[model samples]
Target chain A: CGGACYCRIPACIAGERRYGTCIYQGRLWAFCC
Target chain B: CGGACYCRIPACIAGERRYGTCIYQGRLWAFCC
Candidate 1:
């Protein structure tokens, strides 16, 4: 849910956004902003 | 053994595999290829 962050990287300088892949307590998640 | 940063972004297609950092709880973690 909201407020729960699996993983987060700093703002990339690349032109396109980097796909976010996260893992929390053994769970994996793929998110985008 | 190393861990740094509180975030991580997927490999950027433009530059390929980038440097990485991780965080155990709230500390910095840097690892190598």
Candidate 2:
């Protein structure tokens, strides 16, 4: 099985909607608004 | 709210398990293992 992870920024960040994260290939990745 | 997106690359890419995609800040991103 493959590992999985995620992140979510509820409110706003720098006046932008920011969220989404996951684990792929045994690594972690996230993004910003 | 923030939009969401993703992708899964089964098997392998260049001899590595590649998979993962998401939308953040109104943009798209993908990667390979």
Candidate 3:
């Protein structure tokens, strides 16, 4: 579900066209949360 | 910061190549892992 998100907003201020994940404590949070 | 994610994707569908921040509680989350 994470990689799927990256495919969406590549221009996101968070990254430089790369993918990203919201990992919390050991659990994977939402993709764009 | 999250707004940047919208740049790559204009829909809810994930994997569209987008950027996202891993915000936790009151702190700014990471762009990836």
Candidate 4:
């Protein structure tokens, strides 16, 4: 099992990487890089 | 809202930043940088 991908798709996917957290719309979140 | 966080604690909490994806212990994982 992977980590808790709060996103729709998994960040560990091919050609994908987790970036950093952000507060774009008043909510905290993480992203794939 | 922000992106997505795959860890226990929110990366955007404080003094922390999400890194990238990883395949540790045969499992994919996202971490706070």
Per DockQ, the best of the predicted structures is 2
The reply for model 4, stretches above 4 Å from the true place, is A1-33, B1-14
Sorted on lDDT, best first, the list reads: 4, 2, 3, 1
Best by TM-score: 4
List model 3 lDDT by residue over A1-33, tens digit each.
233232232234453333344544455444442
For every model in order, the TM-score on chain A comes to 0.31, 0.30, 0.26, 0.35
Cα lDDT tens digits, model 1, B1-33, are 223122433322342222444333444433112
For model 2, residues B4-23, the per-residue Cα lDDT tens digits are: 33333333334433455554
Residue A25 displacement in candidate 2 (angstroms): 13
The C-alpha TM-scores of every prediction are 0.24, 0.25, 0.20, 0.27
**Ten-residue stretch with the least lDDT total in model 2 chain B:** B1-10
Q: Higher TM-score: candidate 3 or 4? A: 4
Model 2, A1-33: lDDT tens digits are 222223333333454443655444555555333
Determine which window of 10 residues in candidate 1 chain A has minimal summed lDDT.
A1-10
Q: Model 2's lDDT to the true fold?
A: 0.41
Worst 10 residues of 4 chain A by lDDT: A3-12
**Error at A7, model 2, angstroms:** 6.7
* Model 1 C-alpha lDDT per residue in residues A1-33, reported as the tens digit of each score: 111222434433433333454443454433222
Instruction: Report candidate 2's fraction of native contacts.
Output: 0.19
Tens digits of lDDT, candidate 4, A1-33: 344343323233555555544333344444544
